[PDB]
Each structure stands twice: as structure tokens, then as C-alpha cells.
Amino acid sequence: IVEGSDAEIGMSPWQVMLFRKSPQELLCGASLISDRWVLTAAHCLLYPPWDKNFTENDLLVRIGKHSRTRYERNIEKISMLEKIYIHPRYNWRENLDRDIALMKLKKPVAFSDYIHPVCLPDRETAASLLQAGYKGRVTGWGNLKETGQPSVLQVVNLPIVERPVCKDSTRIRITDNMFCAGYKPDEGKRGDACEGDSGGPFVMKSPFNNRWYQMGIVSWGEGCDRDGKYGFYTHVFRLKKWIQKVIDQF
Amino acid sequence: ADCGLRPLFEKKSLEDKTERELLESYI
Amino acid sequence: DFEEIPEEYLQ
Ligand SMILES: CN(CC(=O)NCc1ccc(C(=N)N)cc1)C(=O)[C@@H](Cc1ccccc1)NS(=O)(=O)Cc1ccccc1
Ligand SMILES: *[C@@H]1O[C@H](CO)[C@@H](O)[C@H](O)[C@H]1NC(C)=O
Ligand code: NA
Ligand code: NA
Secondary structure, three states: OEEOEEOOOOOOOOEOOOEEOOOOOOEEEEEEEEEEEEEHHHHEEEEEHEEEEEHHEEEEEOOOOOOOOOOOOOOEEEEEEEEEEEEEOOEEEOOEEEEOEEEEOOOOOOOEEEEEEOOOOOOOHHHOOOOOOOOEEEOOOOOOOOOOEEEEEEEEEEEOOOHHHHHHHOOOOOOOOOEEEEOOHHOOOOOOOOOOOOOEEEEEEEOOOOOOEEEEEEOOOOOOOOOOOEEEEEOOHHHHHHHHHHHHOO | OOOOOOOHHHHHHOOOOHHHHHHHHOO | OOOOOOOOHHO
């Protein structure tokens, strides 16, 4: 996260760290959506251009964390993966269209002050909140700058951007399964997700029922926090039918 | 059923330091 | 600079 701040304790209790077993390192962010299901970006697991293809046994899920590097004894919980599900139409070849994956845990995780699932949006909440100018919140342990790494979880609030402005900021083909967020050069404020934040949640707090909803997944961006560029996010509601199909079936 | 309600914030009726920024943007 | 995690999770 670039130009953000230290998270408060328990601020994002759905935040998940995807952790590589060997070598031991941060792979990506992710989010807790039930006691057995974790949501992330497909490209965290599969991206052939960079020779990336992780299997279940390569990874661990670390939940309830705050410190990036510490083993947070009596606070975090570490879970093994039973199965990975990548969207069947995930487009790693062109533009990361449908950049979404689910992970089922081997055992349910116990909820605590530090561990709690986020809501997934219904059509109405999505329609209400996914509007240009409305702000969401992105969290992660990724890079603090494009070109080091934070001591603890970082947080930044960013406004959703008008689709034509998103489209005009890039040569990459944008789809309805993406949205973009971030400040314009003229707005003064800044901030962005970065490398290592991928797979983490873009959340919004509904003013109707005061619950947090995950509207986006950190997906891609040209550099980090560049003037005139924006962060792109997987549009969670647009892919919720696939999400429900996987959880229903498996 | 209990999704999206944080033990250390909503469940205790405490707000975090910047959630009001989000609310103020929801016009 | 990651701290080692309990061995049980790597088994
Ligand atoms: C390849 N890629 C995916 C990626 O690296 N995702 C991680 C990520 C997440 C968020 C952000 C952000 N909000 N700035 C940036 C990168 C990119 O973003 C590509 C653009 C792309 C998008 C779709 C398909 C092909 C290319 N941009 S890139 O500039 O190569 C990503 C990057 C940023 C910082 C340091 C090193 C690399
Ligand atoms: C990725 O890994 C799996 C398992 O080894 C393999 O079957 C698959 O062909 C690999 N490549 C992909 C999905 O592009
Ligand atoms: Na364009
Ligand atoms: Na920018």
C-alpha cells in the first residue's frame, strides 16, 4: 500500500495473508468470507507469463494478522488449503479479466476479536455503493512504494473512479468485471495498492446496515500511485454467481 | 449472518479513525 | 525477515 497508514488493531479482521511455505514469504492478500472459504485474485495463484502456478501444498493461509513478518502467537491462526478454485474464464493471457479465485480451508477457522468474515454484496448494495466518488478501503502488506515493506498491515481509503476515466488512463482493455479507484492528479490526495497487496479486499461500509462489504479484489495497476494511473479491482458482485456456484457445489 | 461486523468496532459501537471519510463520500 | 512459524503448520 502506497501513501496509506498503519491499520488499527482488529480494523480488518477478514484480512488474510497468503504465505509461501518455501521460501517463507508473502505471496498475496486475500479475505475471509466464511469459516472455511477464502477469496483472492486468480493471478496470485496462476500467471504463466511470470512462471507462476501454485498448488494447494505450496501455500498457507494466515488469518488475524497485523504484523507483516512476526509470528503472532495466540492471535493469528494458520490454515492449510484443501482446494483451490480458479474462475474458468480467468483471462491471464490479455488483461486479467475475471481475476478471482476461491480457496477452501482444510478445517474451519475459529472466529475471534481478530478474525471475522466480510460480507459479499447483493445486487442492491452493489448498485447503491459502486458509484464514482464513493470511497472504499484497501488493506495489505504489499510494497510501500513502486520501486520498502511495512512493519504492519497498511490501510488506504480511495474513491471509485468514473469508467471513462479508468478507460482513458490505460491502453489495457477494461471490462465490466473490473472497476478502478484512486485520486486524480488534481485532487491532491493520493494512495494506491501495490505489488504484494494483490488478492486483498476493497471494502465499503454500507450506510444502510452498517456492515462491511467486499466490493473489489486488488487486481492490477501500471506501477503504483502514479499520477494519472488508477488501481484496478475485480468486480466481486459481477462474479458472485460463480462464487455461489463453487460454494454450493463444493 | 454476522458478516461484516467487527468485534472491536461495530460490535462495541466504536468507530475506527477513518471510516467517517467513507460515510461522508456516500452522497 | 519473516519469523519462523511452528513446525506443525509445515508438516
Ligand atoms: C501484470 N500485472 C498484474 C500485477 O502485477 N498485479 C499486481 C498489482 C496490483 C495492484 C497494483 C496497483 N493498484 N497499482 C499494481 C500491481 C500488472 O498489473 C501490469 C499490467 C497488466 C495488467 C493485466 C494484464 C497484463 C498486464 N502492470 S505492472 O506495472 O507490470 C505491475 C507492477 C507494479 C509495480 C511494480 C511491478 C509491477
Ligand atoms: C498449472 O499446474 C497444474 C498442475 O500441475 C497443471 O495441470 C497445469 O497444466 C498448469 N498450468 C496452467 C493451468 O496453465
Ligand atoms: Na484507453
Ligand atoms: Na494515481
